[PDB]
Backbone as XML, in Angstrom:
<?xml version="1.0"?>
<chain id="A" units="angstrom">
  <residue number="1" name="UNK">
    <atom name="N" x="87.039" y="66.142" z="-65.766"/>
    <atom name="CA" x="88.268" y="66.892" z="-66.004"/>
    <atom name="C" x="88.050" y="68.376" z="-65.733"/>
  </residue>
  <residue number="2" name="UNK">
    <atom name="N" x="87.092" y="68.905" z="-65.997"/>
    <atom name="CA" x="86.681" y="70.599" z="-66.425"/>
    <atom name="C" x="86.397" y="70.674" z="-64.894"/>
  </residue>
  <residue number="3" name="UNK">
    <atom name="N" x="85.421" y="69.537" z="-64.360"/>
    <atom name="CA" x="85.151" y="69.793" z="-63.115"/>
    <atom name="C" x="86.214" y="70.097" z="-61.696"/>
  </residue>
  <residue number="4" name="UNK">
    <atom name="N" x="87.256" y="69.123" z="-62.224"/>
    <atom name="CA" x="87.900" y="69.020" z="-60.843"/>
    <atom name="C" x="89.330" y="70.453" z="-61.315"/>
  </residue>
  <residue number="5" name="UNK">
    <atom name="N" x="89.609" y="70.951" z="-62.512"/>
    <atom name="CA" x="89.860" y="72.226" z="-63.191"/>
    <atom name="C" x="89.509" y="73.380" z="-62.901"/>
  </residue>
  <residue number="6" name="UNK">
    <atom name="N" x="87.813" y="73.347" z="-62.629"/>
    <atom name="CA" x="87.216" y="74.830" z="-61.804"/>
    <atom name="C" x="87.506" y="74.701" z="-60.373"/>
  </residue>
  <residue number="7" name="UNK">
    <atom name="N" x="87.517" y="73.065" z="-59.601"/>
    <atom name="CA" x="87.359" y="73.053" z="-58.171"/>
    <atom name="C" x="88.790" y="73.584" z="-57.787"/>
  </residue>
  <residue number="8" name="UNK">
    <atom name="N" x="90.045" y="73.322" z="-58.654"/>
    <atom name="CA" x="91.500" y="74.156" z="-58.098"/>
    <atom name="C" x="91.076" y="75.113" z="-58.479"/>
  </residue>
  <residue number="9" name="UNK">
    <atom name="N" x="90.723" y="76.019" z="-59.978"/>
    <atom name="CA" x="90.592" y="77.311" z="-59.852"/>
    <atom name="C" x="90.296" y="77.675" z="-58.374"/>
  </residue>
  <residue number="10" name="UNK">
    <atom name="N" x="89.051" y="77.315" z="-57.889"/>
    <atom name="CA" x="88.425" y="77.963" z="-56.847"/>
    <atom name="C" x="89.174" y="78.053" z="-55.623"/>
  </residue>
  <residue number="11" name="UNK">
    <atom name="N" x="90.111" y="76.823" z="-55.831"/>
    <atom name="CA" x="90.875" y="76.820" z="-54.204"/>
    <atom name="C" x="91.802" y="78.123" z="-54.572"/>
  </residue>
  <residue number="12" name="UNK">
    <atom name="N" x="92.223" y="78.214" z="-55.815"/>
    <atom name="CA" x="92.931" y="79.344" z="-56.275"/>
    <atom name="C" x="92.823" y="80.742" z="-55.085"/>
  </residue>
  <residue number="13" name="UNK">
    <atom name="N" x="91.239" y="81.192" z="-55.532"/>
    <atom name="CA" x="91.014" y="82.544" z="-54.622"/>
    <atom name="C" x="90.668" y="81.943" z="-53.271"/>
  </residue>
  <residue number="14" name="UNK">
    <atom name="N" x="90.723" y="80.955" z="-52.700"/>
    <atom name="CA" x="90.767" y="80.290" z="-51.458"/>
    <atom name="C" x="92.396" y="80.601" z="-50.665"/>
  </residue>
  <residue number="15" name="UNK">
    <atom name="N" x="93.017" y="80.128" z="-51.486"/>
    <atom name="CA" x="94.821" y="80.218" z="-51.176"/>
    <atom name="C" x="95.433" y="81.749" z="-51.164"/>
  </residue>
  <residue number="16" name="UNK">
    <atom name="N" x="94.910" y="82.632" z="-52.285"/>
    <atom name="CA" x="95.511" y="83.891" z="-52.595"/>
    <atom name="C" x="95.056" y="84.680" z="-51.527"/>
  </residue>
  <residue number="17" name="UNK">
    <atom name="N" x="93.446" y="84.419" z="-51.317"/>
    <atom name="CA" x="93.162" y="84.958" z="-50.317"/>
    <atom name="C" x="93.466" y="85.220" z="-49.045"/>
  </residue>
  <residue number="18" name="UNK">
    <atom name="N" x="93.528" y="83.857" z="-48.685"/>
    <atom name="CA" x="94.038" y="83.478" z="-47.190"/>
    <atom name="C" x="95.097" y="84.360" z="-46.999"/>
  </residue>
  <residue number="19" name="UNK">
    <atom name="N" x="96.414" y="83.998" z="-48.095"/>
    <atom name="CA" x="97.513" y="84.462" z="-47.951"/>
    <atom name="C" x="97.429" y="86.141" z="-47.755"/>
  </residue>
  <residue number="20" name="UNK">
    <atom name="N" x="96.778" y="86.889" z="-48.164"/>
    <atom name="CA" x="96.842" y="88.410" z="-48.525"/>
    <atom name="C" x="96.228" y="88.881" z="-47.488"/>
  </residue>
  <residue number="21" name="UNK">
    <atom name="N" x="94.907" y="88.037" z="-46.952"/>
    <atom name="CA" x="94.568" y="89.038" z="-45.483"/>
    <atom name="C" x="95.500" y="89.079" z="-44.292"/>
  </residue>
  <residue number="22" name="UNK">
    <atom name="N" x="96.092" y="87.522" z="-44.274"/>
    <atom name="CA" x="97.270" y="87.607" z="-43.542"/>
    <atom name="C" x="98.290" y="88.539" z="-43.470"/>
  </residue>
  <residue number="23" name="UNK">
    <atom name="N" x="98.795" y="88.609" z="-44.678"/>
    <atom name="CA" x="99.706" y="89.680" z="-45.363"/>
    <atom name="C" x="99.107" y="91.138" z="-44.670"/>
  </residue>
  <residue number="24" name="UNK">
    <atom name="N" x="97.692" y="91.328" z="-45.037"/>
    <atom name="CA" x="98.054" y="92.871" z="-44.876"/>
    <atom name="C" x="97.550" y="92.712" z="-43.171"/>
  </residue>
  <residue number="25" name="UNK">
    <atom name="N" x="97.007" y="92.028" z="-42.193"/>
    <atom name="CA" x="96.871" y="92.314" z="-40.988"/>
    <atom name="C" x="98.375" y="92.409" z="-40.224"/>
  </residue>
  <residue number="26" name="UNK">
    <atom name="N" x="99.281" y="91.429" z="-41.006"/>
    <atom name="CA" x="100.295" y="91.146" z="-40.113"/>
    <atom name="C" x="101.342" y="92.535" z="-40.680"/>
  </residue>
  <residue number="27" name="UNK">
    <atom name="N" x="101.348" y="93.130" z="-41.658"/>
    <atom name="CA" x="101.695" y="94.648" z="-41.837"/>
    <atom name="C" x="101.217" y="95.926" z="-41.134"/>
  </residue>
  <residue number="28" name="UNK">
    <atom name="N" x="100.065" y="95.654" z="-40.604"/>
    <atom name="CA" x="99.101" y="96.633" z="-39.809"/>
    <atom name="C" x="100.158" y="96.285" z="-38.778"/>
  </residue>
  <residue number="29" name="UNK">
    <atom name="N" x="99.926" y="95.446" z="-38.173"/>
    <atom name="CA" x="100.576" y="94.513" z="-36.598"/>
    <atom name="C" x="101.872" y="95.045" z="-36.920"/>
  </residue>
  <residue number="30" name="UNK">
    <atom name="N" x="102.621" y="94.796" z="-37.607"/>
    <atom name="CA" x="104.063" y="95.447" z="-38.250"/>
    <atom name="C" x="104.494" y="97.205" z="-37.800"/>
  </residue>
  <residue number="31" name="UNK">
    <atom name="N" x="103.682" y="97.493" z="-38.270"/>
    <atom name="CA" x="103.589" y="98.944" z="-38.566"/>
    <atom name="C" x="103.335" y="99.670" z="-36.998"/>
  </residue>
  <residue number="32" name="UNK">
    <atom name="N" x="101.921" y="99.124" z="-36.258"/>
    <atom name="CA" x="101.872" y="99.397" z="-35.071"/>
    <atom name="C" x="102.912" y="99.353" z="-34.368"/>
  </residue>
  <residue number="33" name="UNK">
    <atom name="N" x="103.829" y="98.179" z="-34.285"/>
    <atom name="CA" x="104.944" y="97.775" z="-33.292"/>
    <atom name="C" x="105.710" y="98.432" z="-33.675"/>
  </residue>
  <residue number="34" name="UNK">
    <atom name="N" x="106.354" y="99.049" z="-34.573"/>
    <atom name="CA" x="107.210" y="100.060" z="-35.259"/>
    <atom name="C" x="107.237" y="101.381" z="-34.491"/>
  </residue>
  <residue number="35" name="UNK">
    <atom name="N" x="105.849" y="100.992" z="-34.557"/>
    <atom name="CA" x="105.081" y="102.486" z="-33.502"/>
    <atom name="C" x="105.661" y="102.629" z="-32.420"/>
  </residue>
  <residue number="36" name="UNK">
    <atom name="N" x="104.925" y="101.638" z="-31.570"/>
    <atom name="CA" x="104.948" y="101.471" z="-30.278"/>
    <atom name="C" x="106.157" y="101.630" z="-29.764"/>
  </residue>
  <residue number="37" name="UNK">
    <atom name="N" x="107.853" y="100.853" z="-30.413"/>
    <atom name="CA" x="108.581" y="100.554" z="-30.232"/>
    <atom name="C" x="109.741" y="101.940" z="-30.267"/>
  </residue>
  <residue number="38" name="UNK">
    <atom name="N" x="108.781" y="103.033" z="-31.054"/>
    <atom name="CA" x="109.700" y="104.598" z="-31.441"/>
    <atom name="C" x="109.387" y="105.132" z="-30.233"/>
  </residue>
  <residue number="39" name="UNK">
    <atom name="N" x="108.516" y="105.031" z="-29.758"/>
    <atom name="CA" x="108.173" y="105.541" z="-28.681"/>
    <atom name="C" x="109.040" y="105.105" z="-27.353"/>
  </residue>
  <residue number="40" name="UNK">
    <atom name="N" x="109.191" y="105.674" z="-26.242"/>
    <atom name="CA" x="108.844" y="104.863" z="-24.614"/>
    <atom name="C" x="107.988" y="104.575" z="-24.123"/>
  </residue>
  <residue number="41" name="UNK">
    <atom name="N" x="107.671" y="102.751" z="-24.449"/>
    <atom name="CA" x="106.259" y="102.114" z="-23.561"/>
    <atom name="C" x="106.478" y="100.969" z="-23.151"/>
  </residue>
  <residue number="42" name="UNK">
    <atom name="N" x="105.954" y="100.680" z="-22.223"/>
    <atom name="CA" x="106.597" y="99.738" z="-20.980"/>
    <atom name="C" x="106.316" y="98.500" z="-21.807"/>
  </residue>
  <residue number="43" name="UNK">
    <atom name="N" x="107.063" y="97.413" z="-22.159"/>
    <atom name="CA" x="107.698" y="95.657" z="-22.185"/>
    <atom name="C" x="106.082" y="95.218" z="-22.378"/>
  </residue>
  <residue number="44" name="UNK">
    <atom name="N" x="105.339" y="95.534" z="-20.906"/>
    <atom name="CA" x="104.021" y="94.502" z="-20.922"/>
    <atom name="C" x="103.413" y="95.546" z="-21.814"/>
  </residue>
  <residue number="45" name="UNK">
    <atom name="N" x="103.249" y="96.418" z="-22.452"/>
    <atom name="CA" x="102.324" y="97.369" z="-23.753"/>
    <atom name="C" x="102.705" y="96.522" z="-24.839"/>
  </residue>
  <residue number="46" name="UNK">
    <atom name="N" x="103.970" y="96.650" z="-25.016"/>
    <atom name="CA" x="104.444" y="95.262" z="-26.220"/>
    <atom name="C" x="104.230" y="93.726" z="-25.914"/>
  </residue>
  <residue number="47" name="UNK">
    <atom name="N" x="104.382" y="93.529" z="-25.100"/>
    <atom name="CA" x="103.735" y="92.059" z="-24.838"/>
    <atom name="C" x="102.222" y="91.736" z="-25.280"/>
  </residue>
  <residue number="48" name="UNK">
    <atom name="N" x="101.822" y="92.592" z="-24.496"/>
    <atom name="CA" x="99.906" y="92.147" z="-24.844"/>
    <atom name="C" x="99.846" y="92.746" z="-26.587"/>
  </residue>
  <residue number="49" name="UNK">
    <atom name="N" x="100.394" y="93.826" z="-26.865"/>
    <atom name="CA" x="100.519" y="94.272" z="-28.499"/>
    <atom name="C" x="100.663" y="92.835" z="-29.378"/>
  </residue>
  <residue number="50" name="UNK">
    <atom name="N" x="101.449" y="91.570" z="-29.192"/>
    <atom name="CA" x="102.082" y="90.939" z="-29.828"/>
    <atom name="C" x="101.376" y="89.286" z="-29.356"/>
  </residue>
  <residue number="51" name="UNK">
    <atom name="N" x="100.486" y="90.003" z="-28.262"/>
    <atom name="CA" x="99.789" y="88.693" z="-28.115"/>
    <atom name="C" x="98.296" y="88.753" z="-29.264"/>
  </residue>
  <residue number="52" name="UNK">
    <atom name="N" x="97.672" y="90.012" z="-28.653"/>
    <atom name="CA" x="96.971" y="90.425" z="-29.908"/>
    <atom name="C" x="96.890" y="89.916" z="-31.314"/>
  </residue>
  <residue number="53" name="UNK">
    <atom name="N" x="97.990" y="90.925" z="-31.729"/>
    <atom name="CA" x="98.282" y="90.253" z="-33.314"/>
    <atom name="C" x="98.551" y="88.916" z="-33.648"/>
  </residue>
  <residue number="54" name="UNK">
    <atom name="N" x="99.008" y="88.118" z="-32.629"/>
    <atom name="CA" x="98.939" y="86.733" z="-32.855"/>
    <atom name="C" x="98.068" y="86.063" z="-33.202"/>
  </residue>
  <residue number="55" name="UNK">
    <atom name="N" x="96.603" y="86.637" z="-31.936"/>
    <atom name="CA" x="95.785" y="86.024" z="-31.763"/>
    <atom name="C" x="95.135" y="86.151" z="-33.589"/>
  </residue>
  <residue number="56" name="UNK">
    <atom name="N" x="95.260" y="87.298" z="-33.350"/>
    <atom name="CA" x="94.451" y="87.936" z="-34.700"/>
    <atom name="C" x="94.760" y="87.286" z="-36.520"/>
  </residue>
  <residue number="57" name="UNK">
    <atom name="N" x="96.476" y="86.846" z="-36.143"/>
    <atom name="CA" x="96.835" y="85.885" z="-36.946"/>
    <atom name="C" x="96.278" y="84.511" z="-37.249"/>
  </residue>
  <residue number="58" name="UNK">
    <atom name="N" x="96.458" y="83.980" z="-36.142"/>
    <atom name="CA" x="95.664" y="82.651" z="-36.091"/>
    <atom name="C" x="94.311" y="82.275" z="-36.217"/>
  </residue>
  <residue number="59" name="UNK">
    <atom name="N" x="93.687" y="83.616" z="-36.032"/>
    <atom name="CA" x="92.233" y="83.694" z="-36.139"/>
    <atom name="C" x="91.988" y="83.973" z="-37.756"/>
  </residue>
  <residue number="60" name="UNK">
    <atom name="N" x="92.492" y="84.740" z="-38.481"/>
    <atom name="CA" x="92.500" y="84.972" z="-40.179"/>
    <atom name="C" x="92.664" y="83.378" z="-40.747"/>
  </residue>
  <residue number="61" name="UNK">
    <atom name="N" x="94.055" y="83.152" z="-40.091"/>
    <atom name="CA" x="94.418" y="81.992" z="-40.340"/>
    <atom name="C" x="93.318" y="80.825" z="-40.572"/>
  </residue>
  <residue number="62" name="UNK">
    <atom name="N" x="92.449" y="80.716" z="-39.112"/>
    <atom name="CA" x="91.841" y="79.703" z="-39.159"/>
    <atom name="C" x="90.376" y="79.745" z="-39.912"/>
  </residue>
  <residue number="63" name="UNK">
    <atom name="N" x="89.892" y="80.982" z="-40.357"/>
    <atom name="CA" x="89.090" y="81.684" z="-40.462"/>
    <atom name="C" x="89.242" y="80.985" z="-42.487"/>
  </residue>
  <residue number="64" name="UNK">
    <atom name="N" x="90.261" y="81.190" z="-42.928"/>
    <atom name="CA" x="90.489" y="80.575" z="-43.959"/>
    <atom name="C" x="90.771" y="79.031" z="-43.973"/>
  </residue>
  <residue number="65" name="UNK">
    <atom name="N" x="91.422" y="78.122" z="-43.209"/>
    <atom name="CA" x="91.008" y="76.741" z="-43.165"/>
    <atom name="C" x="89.957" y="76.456" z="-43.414"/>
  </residue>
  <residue number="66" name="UNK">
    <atom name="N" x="89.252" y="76.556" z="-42.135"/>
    <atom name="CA" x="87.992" y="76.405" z="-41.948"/>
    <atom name="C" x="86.727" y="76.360" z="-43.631"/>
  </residue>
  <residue number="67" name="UNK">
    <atom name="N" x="87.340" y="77.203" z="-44.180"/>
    <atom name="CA" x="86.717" y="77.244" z="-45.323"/>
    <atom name="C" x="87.400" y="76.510" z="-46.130"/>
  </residue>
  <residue number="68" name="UNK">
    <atom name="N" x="88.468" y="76.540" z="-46.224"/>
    <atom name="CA" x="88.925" y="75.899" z="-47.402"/>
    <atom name="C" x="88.739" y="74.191" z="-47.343"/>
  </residue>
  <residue number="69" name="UNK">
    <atom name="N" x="88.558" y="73.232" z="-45.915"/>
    <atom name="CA" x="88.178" y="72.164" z="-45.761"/>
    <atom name="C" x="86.510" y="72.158" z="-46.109"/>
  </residue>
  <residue number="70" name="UNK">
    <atom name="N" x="86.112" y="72.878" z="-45.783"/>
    <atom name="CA" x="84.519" y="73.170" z="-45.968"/>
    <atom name="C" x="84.172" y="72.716" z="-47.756"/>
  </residue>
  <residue number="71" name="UNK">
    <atom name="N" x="85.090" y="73.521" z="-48.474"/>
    <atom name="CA" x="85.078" y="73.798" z="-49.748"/>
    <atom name="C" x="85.858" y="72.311" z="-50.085"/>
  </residue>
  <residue number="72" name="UNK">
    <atom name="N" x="86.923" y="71.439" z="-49.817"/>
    <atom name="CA" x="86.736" y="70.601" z="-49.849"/>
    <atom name="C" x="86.464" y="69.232" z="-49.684"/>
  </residue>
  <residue number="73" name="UNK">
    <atom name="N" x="85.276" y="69.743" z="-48.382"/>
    <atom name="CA" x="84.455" y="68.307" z="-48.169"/>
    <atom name="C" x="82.989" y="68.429" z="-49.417"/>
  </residue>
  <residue number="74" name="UNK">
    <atom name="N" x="82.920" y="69.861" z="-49.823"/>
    <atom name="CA" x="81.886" y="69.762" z="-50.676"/>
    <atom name="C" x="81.813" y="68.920" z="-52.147"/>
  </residue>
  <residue number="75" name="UNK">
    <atom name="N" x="83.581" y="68.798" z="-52.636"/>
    <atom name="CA" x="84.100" y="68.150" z="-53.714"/>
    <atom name="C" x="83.862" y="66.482" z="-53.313"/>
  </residue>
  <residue number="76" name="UNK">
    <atom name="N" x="84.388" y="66.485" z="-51.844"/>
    <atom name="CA" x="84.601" y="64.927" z="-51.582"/>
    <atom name="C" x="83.276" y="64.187" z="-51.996"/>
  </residue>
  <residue number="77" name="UNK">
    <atom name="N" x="82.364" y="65.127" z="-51.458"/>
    <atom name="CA" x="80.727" y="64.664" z="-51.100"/>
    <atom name="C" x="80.268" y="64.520" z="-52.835"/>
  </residue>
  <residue number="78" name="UNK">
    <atom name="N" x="80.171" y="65.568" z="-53.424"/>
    <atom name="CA" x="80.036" y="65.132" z="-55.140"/>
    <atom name="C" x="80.693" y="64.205" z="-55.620"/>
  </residue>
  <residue number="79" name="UNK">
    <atom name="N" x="81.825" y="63.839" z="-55.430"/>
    <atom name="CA" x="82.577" y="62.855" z="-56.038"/>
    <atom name="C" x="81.854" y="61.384" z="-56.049"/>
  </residue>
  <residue number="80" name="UNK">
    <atom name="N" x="81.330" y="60.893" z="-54.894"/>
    <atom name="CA" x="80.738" y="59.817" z="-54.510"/>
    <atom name="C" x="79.052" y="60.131" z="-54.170"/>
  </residue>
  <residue number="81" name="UNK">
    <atom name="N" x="78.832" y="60.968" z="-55.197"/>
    <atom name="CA" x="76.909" y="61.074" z="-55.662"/>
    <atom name="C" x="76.716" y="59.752" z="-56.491"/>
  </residue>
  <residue number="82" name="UNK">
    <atom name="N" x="75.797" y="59.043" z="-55.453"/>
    <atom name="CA" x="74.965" y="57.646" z="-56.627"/>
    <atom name="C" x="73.657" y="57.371" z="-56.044"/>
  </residue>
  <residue number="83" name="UNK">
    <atom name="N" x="72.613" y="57.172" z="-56.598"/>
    <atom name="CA" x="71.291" y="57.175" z="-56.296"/>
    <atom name="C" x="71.245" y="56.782" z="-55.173"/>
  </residue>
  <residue number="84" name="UNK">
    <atom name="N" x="70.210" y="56.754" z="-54.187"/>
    <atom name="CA" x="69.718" y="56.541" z="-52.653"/>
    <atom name="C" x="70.478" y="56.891" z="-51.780"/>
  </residue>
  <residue number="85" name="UNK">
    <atom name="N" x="71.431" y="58.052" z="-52.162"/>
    <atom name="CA" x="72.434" y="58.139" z="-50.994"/>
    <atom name="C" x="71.549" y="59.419" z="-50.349"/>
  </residue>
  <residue number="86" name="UNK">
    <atom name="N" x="71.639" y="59.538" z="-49.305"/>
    <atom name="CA" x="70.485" y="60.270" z="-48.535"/>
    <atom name="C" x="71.483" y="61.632" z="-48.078"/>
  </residue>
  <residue number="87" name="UNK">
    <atom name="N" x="70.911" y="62.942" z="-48.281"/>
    <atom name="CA" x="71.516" y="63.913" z="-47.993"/>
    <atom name="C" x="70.872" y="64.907" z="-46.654"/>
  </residue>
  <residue number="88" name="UNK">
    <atom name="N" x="71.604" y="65.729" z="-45.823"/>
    <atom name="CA" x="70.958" y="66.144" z="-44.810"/>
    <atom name="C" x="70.971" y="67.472" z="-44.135"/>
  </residue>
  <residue number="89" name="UNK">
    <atom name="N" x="71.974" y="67.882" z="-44.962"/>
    <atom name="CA" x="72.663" y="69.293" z="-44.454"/>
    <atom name="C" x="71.532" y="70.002" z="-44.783"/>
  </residue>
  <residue number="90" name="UNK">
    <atom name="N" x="71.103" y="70.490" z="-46.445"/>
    <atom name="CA" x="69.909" y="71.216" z="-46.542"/>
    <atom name="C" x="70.924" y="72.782" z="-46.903"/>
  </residue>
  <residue number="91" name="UNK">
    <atom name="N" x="71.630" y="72.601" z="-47.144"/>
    <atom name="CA" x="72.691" y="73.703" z="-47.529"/>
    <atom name="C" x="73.944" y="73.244" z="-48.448"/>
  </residue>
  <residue number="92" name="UNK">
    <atom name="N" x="74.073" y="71.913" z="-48.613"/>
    <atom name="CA" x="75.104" y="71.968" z="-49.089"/>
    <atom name="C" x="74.570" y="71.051" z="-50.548"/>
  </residue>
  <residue number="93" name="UNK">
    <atom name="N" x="73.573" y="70.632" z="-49.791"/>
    <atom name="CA" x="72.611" y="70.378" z="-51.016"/>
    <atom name="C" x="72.209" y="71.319" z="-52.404"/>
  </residue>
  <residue number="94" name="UNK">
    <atom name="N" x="72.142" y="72.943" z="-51.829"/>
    <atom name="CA" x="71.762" y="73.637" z="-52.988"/>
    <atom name="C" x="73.432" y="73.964" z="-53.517"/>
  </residue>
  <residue number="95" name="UNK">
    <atom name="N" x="74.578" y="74.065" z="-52.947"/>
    <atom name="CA" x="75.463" y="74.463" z="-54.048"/>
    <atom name="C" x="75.803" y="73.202" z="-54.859"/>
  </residue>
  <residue number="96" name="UNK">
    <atom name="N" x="75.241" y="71.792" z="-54.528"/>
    <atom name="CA" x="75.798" y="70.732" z="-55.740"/>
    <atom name="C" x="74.029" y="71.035" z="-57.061"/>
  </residue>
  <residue number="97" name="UNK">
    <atom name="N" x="73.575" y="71.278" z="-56.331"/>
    <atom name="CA" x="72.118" y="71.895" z="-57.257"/>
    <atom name="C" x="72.648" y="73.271" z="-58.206"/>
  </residue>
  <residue number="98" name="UNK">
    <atom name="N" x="72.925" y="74.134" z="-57.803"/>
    <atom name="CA" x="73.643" y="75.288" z="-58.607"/>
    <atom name="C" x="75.358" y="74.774" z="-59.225"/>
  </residue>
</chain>
């Protein structure tokens, strides 16, 4: 019960997180284009501007998946611990040890 209690806590700063770097890159990206857009600058300056920040979106984006499946294949893998089951990573071994 307590266990699988801390494992949402944890997705907790997994989720808040994700959400907030997003948040503030895509305000940066915001703010720039605001910029760009007060100004006179040619269509393709805003184009590649907006490909950028995309990229840069999807990359935060995935940058947090990536972990957050990570974090829970580590639950899946404890869940179904029973003697002789053979382990191999050598890393994921010490956080069910700690």
């Amino acid at each position: 019960s307590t266990l699988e209690a801390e494992m949402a806590v944890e997705r907790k700063a997994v989720e808040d997180q994700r959400d907030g770097e997003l948040e503030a890159r895509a305000q940066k990206l915001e703010a720039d284009l605001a910029e760009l857009e007060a100004e006179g600058a040619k269509a393709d300056a805003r184009r590649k501007v907006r490909d950028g920040g995309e990229r840069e979106m999807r990359q935060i984006r995935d940058r947090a998946q990536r972990e957050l499946d990570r974090l829970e294949d580590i639950w899946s893998t404890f869940t179904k611990l029973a003697p002789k089951q053979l382990i191999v990573d050598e890393n994921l071994y010490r956080e069910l040890v700690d």
